[PDB]
Amino acid sequence: NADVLAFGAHSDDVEIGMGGTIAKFVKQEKKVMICDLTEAELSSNGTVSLRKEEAAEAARILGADKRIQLTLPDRGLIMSDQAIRSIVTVIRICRPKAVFMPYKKDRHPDHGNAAALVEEAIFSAGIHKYKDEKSLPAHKVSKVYYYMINGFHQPDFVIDISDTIEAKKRSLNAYKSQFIPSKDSVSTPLTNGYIEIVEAREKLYGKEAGVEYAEGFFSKRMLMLDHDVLG
Amino acid sequence: NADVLAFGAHSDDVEIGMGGTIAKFVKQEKKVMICDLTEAELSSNGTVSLRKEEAAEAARILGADKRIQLTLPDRGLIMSDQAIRSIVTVIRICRPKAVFMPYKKDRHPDHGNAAALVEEAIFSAGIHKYKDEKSLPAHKVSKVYYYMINGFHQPDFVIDISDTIEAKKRSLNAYKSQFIPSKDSVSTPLTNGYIEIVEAREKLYGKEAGVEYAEGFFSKRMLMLDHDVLG
Amino acid sequence: NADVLAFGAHSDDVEIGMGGTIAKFVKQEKKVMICDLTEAELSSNGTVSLRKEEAAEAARILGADKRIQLTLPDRGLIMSDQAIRSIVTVIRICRPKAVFMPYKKDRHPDHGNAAALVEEAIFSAGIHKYKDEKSLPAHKVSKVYYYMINGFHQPDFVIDISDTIEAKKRSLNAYKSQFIPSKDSVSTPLTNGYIEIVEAREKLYGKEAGVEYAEGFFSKRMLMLDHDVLG
Amino acid sequence: NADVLAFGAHSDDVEIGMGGTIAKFVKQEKKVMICDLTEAELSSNGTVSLRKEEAAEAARILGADKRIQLTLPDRGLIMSDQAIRSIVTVIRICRPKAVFMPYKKDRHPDHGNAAALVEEAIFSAGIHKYKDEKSLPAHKVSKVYYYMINGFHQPDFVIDISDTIEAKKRSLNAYKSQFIPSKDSVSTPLTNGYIEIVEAREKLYGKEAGVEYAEGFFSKRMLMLDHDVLG
Amino acid sequence: NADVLAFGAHSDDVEIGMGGTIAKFVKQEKKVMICDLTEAELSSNGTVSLRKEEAAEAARILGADKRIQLTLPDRGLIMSDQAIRSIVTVIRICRPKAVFMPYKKDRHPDHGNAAALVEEAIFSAGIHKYKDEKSLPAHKVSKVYYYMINGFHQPDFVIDISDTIEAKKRSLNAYKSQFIPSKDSVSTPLTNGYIEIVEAREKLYGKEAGVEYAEGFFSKRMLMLDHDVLG
Amino acid sequence: NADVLAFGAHSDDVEIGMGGTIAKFVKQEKKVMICDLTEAELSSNGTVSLRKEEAAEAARILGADKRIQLTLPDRGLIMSDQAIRSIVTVIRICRPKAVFMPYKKDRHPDHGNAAALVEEAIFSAGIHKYKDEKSLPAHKVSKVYYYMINGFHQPDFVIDISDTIEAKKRSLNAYKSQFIPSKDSVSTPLTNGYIEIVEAREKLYGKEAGVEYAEGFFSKRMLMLDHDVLG
Ligand SMILES: O=C(O)C[C@H](O[C@H]1O[C@H](CO)[C@@H](O)[C@H](O)[C@H]1NC(=O)NO)C(=O)O
Ligand SMILES: O=C(O)C[C@H](O[C@H]1O[C@H](CO)[C@@H](O)[C@H](O)[C@H]1NC(=O)NO)C(=O)O
Ligand SMILES: O=C(O)C[C@H](O[C@H]1O[C@H](CO)[C@@H](O)[C@H](O)[C@H]1NC(=O)NO)C(=O)O
Ligand SMILES: O=C(O)C[C@H](O[C@H]1O[C@H](CO)[C@@H](O)[C@H](O)[C@H]1NC(=O)NO)C(=O)O
Ligand SMILES: O=C(O)C[C@H](O[C@H]1O[C@H](CO)[C@@H](O)[C@H](O)[C@H]1NC(=O)NO)C(=O)O
Ligand SMILES: O=C(O)C[C@H](O[C@H]1O[C@H](CO)[C@@H](O)[C@H](O)[C@H]1NC(=O)NO)C(=O)O
Ligand SMILES: [Zn+2]
Ligand SMILES: [Zn+2]
Ligand SMILES: [Zn+2]
Ligand SMILES: [Zn+2]
Ligand SMILES: [Zn+2]
Ligand SMILES: [Zn+2]
16 A cells, blocks of 8 residues: 555656655655656666666665566557556556656657556556456555656646755766766766756745745646645 | 635625635634625625625624725726725735635626735735835735636635535525525526525535535645645 | 437446437437447446446437447547547448537546547548448538536536436436446445536536526537527 | 627727628628727827728728717726726617627737726626716626737637628728828838738638638637537 | 758648748758658549659759658558657658648648657657667757648747748649649548638738748747847 | 847846846847836835946946836836836837837736836837827837746747856846845845746756756747748
C-alpha cells in the first residue's frame, strides 16, 4: 500500500519534476514508489546498465521504498492495449493513494505519451473485470497529479520543497552520465547547465508562493481543499 | 484579526456563493466577518431596512462574527479612488488572513465590478504610505479567493460542505423578500426556484469530489498545498 | 435515411447525454438511430446479455427506430484502421443528417477514444474511394454534435428537454443493473445517486436558458443559425 | 417593440459587422432599430453633419425602421453612471427582443468600451427601481449578440447573408467620406480597400458554413437551439 | 542541407498553406524541399499518376529543389513506430534548418495526424541511438512551424507574400484535377471556388499586417526575435 | 523620432521587464526613451526625490536618450480622458516606431492599469482631430509590445540579452532604496532577493531559446516576420 507511486518515461524524469516532493513525503514517513516505463536505451550518454545503477542511487538518496523497472521501448510509447496492461499490474501491486506522472506539454514526446498510457492504466486498474498479467484485484487511485520535466508552465498548485532542495540536487547529481560532461560524452540539452535551470524554475515557483523553493503540479481531477484553504 | 473577510456586492451574495463554507469555518472556531459593499437599494423585492434585518439573521444563522455595511451605490460600483479607499478601511480594520469575493463571470455586472474594487483594495491595503479614511496601518492579506453567485463554472478547487448544507439553506431562507413570492412580490430570477438551483450546483461539485455537497472557488494567487496533497 | 445517429461507447452513454433530446426528436417525427461501439463486457455490474435487454428497453422507451450493436472492445477503443472502417459502415447504412457522440472531457477514457474514432469515420464515410466492409456509397453527414456523459462543462448550446425529462429518467431506469443496487451489485460511481446528478446538471443548464431542463452540446463545425437567432 | 436594436460606437460600425443580417431581418418583416453612441466627431475624413446624412442613407438602404443618435464623446466612452443611463433610455424606448453590439477584441478601443457600456445598460434596463432620464418601465432583453468590426475571429455562430451581400455593400458605399478617397481625404485603414476586406471575411465565414457569404457573431448568454439543430 | 523541408499529408497541402512563402524563400536563394507523406490514392478526383505529374509541376513553378514522395496510406496516418521511422529518414537526408507541417485544427484528420507523426520524427531524428532505415546520423532541426490548409485561425505570426501571390496561384492551378471541374469530376470542397477562398484568407492576414497578402504560421517552440522586433 | 518608447507605472518597471533589451537596442544605435507614468510617491522605501536620482542613474547605465516623468498618481491610474491625453502628448513628442508597456497579468494592479491607459493613448495619438495638451500632430506607432514585471508567463517571443545581462543588473542595482535593505528599510517583495528572481526568469527564457539569458514579450498586434523565420 504505497502512499505515492510516481511514474516517469525514463529514470531521472521523476527526480527532475518532483524529487524535492518525494524527499519531503519520505520525511513525513509516507511510502513512495518510483516506476520507470523504459530503460532509456536510446540515451545519447551512458548505457542501460550504468543508468540502472545511477537510478538506484537517486532512489536511495530520496528514500524511495522501491524502484520498479518496466521495459516499454524508449521512443516507442505508442498507445497499445498491452502497454496499458503492463502499467495496470504496477498500479494494482503498489495500491497507491496518489499517482504522479509527467505533464504532457514538453518538448520530449515520450513525456506526454507516458502520461496518456498512465491515465488509461489508472482507469483500467479500477475495473474488476479488466484482467492484468498477475490477475490482481481492482484498485482505485484517489489523487492523480502531473509534474513538469522540460516545461516552465503556470501550475495548478505548488509544494514547498525549501527543506529538501539539497536532497533533490543530490538525486540529480547521481545521474552523472546524463548531466555531467566526460571524455566520451556528447552534447545534449541535459549536459549544458540543466540542474541549474531546474533550480531556477523551483526558485521562481517558490517566489509565487513566498518560500525559497517549490515544485509545480497539475491536477485534471477536481482538487478538494480543507486545511490548506486557511493554512 | 478575522481569519476570513467575505465581500459581496449585495447581502445574500456571500451566502449563495459560500454560506456552507462560512458555517464550516465558524464550527472550526475561525472568526468570519462579512462585508456588503451596497445596501441593495435597487432590489426589485423588499426595502433597504427589511433587507438589513434579513442579512443580520442570515449572519446569525451562519455564526459570522460581524456584518459590515458599506454604502456604495447598487448598480454604481464604477472603479474610483474613493470606492477603493472605503474598502481599504474595512480590510485594515478586520486584518483578515483570507479575503473572499465574487467571481467576475456572472450575468450581474455588480459582481465583477465588486471583485475589481476589492482586488485594488487588497493591494492598496498593504501599502503603508496609502492612507485610508481611519489612518490605519498596512495589512497584507495572505489568501484571496473567488466564489460563484449566478455562475456554474469549473472551479479551481472545492470545499466539502456536506455537514453545513442545512445551515446554508437556512441562511438563504432568511432572505424571504428575495427568494419567496408574496402578495406584492415581482418575478425575478431569484423568486423562481433559485435556492434549489444553488443546491443542484453544490450537489454537482460534490460529485466531482466524491462528497454530497461542495462549494467551488477560484484563486488567482498561486495555491501552495501541503496536507491536502495526500489528505 | 436517419435524421439522427447517436454513438456511445457503452449502452446508457447516449441516454445519459441526450435521452431527453432523442425523445424530443422522435416526438417531432424524426428517425433516430443509436449505435453502441462496445458490448460493455467489462461493466462491474450485470452481464453482456442482460445489458443488451436493458438497452433494447431504453431504446423502445425513447422511441429510437433501431439500436446497432458493434463489438469493439470495452477499454480497447485504440485508434485503428479496422475500428474506423467498422464505424464507416454504420454511417453509410444510416445516412444520417446529424451524428452525435461523446464529448472527450470525461473521466472515462473510452468516451474520448470513441469520439476520436467517430470523427475519423465521419470524414472517411464521405470519401467515395474509401471502401467499407459492405462496399457502400459515400455519405456526407451535415451536423456533428458532442453530448456530455460524466462531465459538467459549459456547453456551446442547449436543447430544451423540459417536456421529455420523464422519458429520459424512464430510459435510464431501464438500466437497473447499472444504476440500482441489488444483492450482488458492487459499488460504482453509477450506483450512488447518479440519475439524480444527471437531473441536477439538466436543471442547471435549464436555468442558464430560462427553462426547467436542458441538455448541453458542443459543435466543432461552425453553427449556422436562422430561426433560433430571434426565436 | 423593436425585434432588434443594434448599437455601434460610430455610424458604419453596425453596417460593417452585420449590415447583411439587418437587411435579412427587415426582409423577414422584423423591426430593426440602429443606435450610434457617438457622432464620430474625431473621424479623420468628413464632418459630423455629412456623416449623419450618410448614416441616414445607409439605414434607408438596409430598411432599418429608426436611427437613434446619442452624443457620447468619440474616444471618450469611459465607463460612467451617466453614460449607462443614456443607453438604458434607448433600450427602454425600443423594448428590443435582441440587442447587438461590437465584439471587444478590436484594434479600436471605442468598440470594446461601447460593448462594456451596452452590457451595463442591458442589466440596468431590467431593474424597475433603476431610473432612466425618461422614467420608463423595466425591459428585459432576451437575446444579446456581438458582431465583428475590425476583427477576423472564430465566431460562436454565423448567419447566411448570401441573399443580402449586395444590400450590405450598398450600405457601406453610402459612407463615401469614410471608404472612398477624394481630393481632400487623408489615408486611414478605412480608405485602402476596406469594403473588399469585409467581403473577404464574410466569404471565409460562408465557406465554414457551406454558403457564399455569412456574418459571424458571439453570445455570452447561453444559446438555446431548436429548429437549427437539424435545420 | 536544405534550408527548409515542408511536409504535407497530400500533394497540394504545402502549396495551399505556404506556397507564397516557398516561392519567397527560393527567390532569397534558400534550398526548399517538399515531402508528401501519402500518394493521395483516395482523392475523389484524378489518379495517383496524374497527381504526381501535377505535384512535379507545382514544385517546378515554386522553384522547390526536390519533391520527396512517401507511401504512407491516405486516411491511414495512424501513429506507428514504422511510420515515424520513414519520416526520420527524410529529415536526416535533407538536414533542414526549418521544418513546416500542417496545423492540426483542420476538418481533415490526416492534417493533424501528419503533424503528430512529423513532431515524433523531428524528436527521434536528433537521437543518435535511434536508427532509421538508411542508418543516417542524428540531425537537430532548429525551427518548427505549422501552416494552415483548411483553417482560418488567428496565427502566431505572418510572412508577407505580396510579391509571390501570383506564383502561389500558379502552383495551385497546376492541380487541375483537384480544383477545376471537368466532364468526369465529382463535387468536393476543393472544386467549388477553393483557390479564391485561400486568396481571401491571405488578403485578411495581409490586412492584419499592413500588406496585400500574408500567410499565417504557428510555432510551439519559443520564437526568438532580433531584426524583426523593430524591422 | 525615437526608435523605442518604453512606459512603466513606476521607475524600475522598464528595467525589470526589459533593461537587457534597452541596453541591446542602444548598442545597435537605436534611440530609446523611457517614460514613468508616476513618481512612485507611495513606495514603502525611499522618497520621490531619491527615486528620481536612482532612475536617472539607471537610464544613464542603459544609455537611454531621455527619461520622461509624468505625474499621474501612484495607485491612482484609473481610466480617465485627462490621463490618456497626458500620455498622448508623450507619444506625439517622441514619435516612436515601437512602444513597450507592462503586461497586465501581474499582482500589482498599476501595471495592468498603466497598460490600459497606454493602449488608449496609442490609438488616440494616431487620430488627427484628437487634441493633446501641446497641439501636436497625429503619430502612428508601428509596433506595440508588453514586458513582464512581477509575472513569469509563457511569452509570445523572447529577445536574447545574453550580452547585456550585466548592464541590466547594474541598472537594477541603481535602485538601492528599492532592492537593498538599509537601517531604515521595510520589508517588501522587492527587498528579499528580487534581482536574483529576475535573473532566474531570464535564465529560464534563455533555455527555451538556446541562449544564456532572454527577456519575454507579448504582442496583441499581429507579428510579421521576415529575417527571423530562418535566422
Ligand atoms: O532531449 C533530451 O533531453 C536528451 C536526450 O535524452 C532524453 O531522450 C532520450 C531519448 O528518448 C532518453 O533515452 C533520455 O532518457 C531522455 N532524458 C530525459 O527525458 N531526461 O528527463 C538524449 O539522451 O539525447
Ligand atoms: O438579477 C437578479 O438577480 C434580480 C435582481 O437582484 C439583483 O440585482 C439588484 C440590482 O443590482 C440588487 O439590488 C439585488 O441585490 C441583486 N441580487 C443579487 O445579486 N443576489 O445575489 C432584482 O432585484 O431584480
Ligand atoms: O466508471 C464508471 O462509470 C463505472 C464503470 O462503468 C463504465 O466503465 C466500464 C468499463 O469501461 C463500462 O463497461 C461501463 O459501460 C461504463 N459505464 C458507462 O460509461 N456508463 O455511462 C463500471 O462498470 O465499473
Ligand atoms: O482607425 C480607423 O478605423 C480610422 C479612424 O476612424 C475610426 O476612429 C475614429 C476615432 O475614434 C472614429 O471617429 C471613426 O468613426 C472610426 N471609424 C470606425 O470605427 N469605423 O468602423 C479615423 O477616422 O482615422
Ligand atoms: O475533403 C477534401 O478536401 C476533398 C477530398 O480531398 C482530401 O481528402 C482525400 C482523402 O484523404 C485526399 O486524397 C486529398 O488529397 C485531400 N485533399 C487535400 O487535403 N487537399 O489539401 C476528396 O478528394 O474528396
Ligand atoms: O509590491 C511591491 O512590489 C512593493 C511596493 O512597490 C510597488 O508598489 C508601490 C505602490 O504602488 C510603488 O510606489 C512602487 O513603485 C512599486 N514598485 C514596483 O512596481 N516595482 O516594479 C512597495 O513599495 O511596498
Ligand atoms: Zn524523460
Ligand atoms: Zn448580488
Ligand atoms: Zn460509457
Ligand atoms: Zn467604429
Ligand atoms: Zn491534404
Ligand atoms: Zn511598478
